[PDB]
Amino acid sequence: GSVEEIRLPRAGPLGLSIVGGSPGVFISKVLPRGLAARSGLRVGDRILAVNGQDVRDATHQEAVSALLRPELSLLVRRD
């Protein structure tokens, strides 16, 4: 139905947890106060890309590394 761009204005910690990686990488937790929650990311979001980096079939660690690059634009899909 839709793909969405969720952009986080980083200060640093994002305030989210991910599961999955090499059947896709998914947001498993969003700290209520954290930057991710404030920016509109939601549990169940599947991360497709990070700042243009395709992470659809990324490793778990690869996804972590992409998220910790030095705004953080996340392309996500919800199933």
């Binding site: 994002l14 991910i18 972590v64």
Partner: peptide
């Protein structure tokens, strides 16, 4: 069971 990483 499913590794979860805080970021």
């Amino acid at each position: 069971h499913f590794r979860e990483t805080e970021v």
